[PDB]
Amino acid sequence: MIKDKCFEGVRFEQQDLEGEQFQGCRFIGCNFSWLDLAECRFVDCSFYDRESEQSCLLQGCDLREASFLRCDLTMADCSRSQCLGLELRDCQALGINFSRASFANQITVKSYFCEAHLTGNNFSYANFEGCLLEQCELSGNRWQGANLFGASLAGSDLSGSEFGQIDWASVNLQGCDLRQCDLPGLDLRRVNLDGVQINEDQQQALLEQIGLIVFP
Amino acid sequence: MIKDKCFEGVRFEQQDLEGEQFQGCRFIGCNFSWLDLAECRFVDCSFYDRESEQSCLLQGCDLREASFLRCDLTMADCSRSQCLGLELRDCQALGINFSRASFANQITVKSYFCEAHLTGNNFSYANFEGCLLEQCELSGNRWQGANLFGASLAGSDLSGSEFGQIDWASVNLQGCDLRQCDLPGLDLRRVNLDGVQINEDQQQALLEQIGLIVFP
User: A38 near A63, Cβ under 8 Å?
Assistant: First the structure.
């Protein structure tokens, strides 16, 4: 257990991550890239320095079954990482980069399935371009200004999201639980919603979007 | 006022209609074709004989501002007739033929209007193919099996209709009042309902049609 430490400008080595538990630590301008962080747990840790605007690098990391609770991951570069089973709970993740990250188990050449547990996070302006998070737990996040271009979230629980005006047409949402979400601008003529779950109170806005007038 | 008279096999001439009013009459195998019936009034009259299965011909009639109230117009041939302002209320009109009939004042598509007052009628298996009936009073009718192919009902009050499984994609319904109508199989991706009025209780079936799952 590593606690209450401040690391500044550190290029970490594999040996430094061995105990795999961090609590109340500050990581300022640190590089974890291409290291094995599988099963590591971080609680109440900062990876972003407000004053210097320094962020951390986690490019190509093994993050499989890593967990982050109440961390500040603002601007963290997690691109190209292995993220099967990754858990992010209640994190500040403004501008987090997951481009080219996998959340999948490529079990054979023919088959894969995804797993991820991402809840209560601020993913405002995050980069999830091209990412597959299918049949994952993705509920109760904020996604305002996030890049979901070419992503597939098919079959995932996205209940209780704060979306804002997502480019709905460029993300696969088939089978998604979209209950208790704002869906502004979502045009059912341009977006496949097959198997999507909604509440009765979301019906009117979808129909008004395509020109219907709904009376009591 | 011509009252409780029976006419059979009769080829009518124009003079026979100067007494513009008829009540409780029967017309069995009668021909009104190419006559001016403008502003004529028929109440509780029959134009169709059941045991005989004989119907009447009204081909190319001037039926403008004419009125039929609680009349049996089953199988009547009104093809090619002028019907601007025609009123049919609470008529039995199974199989009525309005092929090539006009309900419009349309010299050009740049400025025109339609008019018709067709309410409470049984239009089961009626032929309205290609008819322009826009912004007309068309409420409370039964349309089971009617040919509406190429018809435009845009802007009309169709509230309280019994439609059945209409070919929705080949009739113009934009701006229509469809409150209290059955809309079975109406697929929003294929059918433009811009400006259409519906009630809250009609939303779920429309959205379920395109694959959404609606919860309380």
Answer: yes
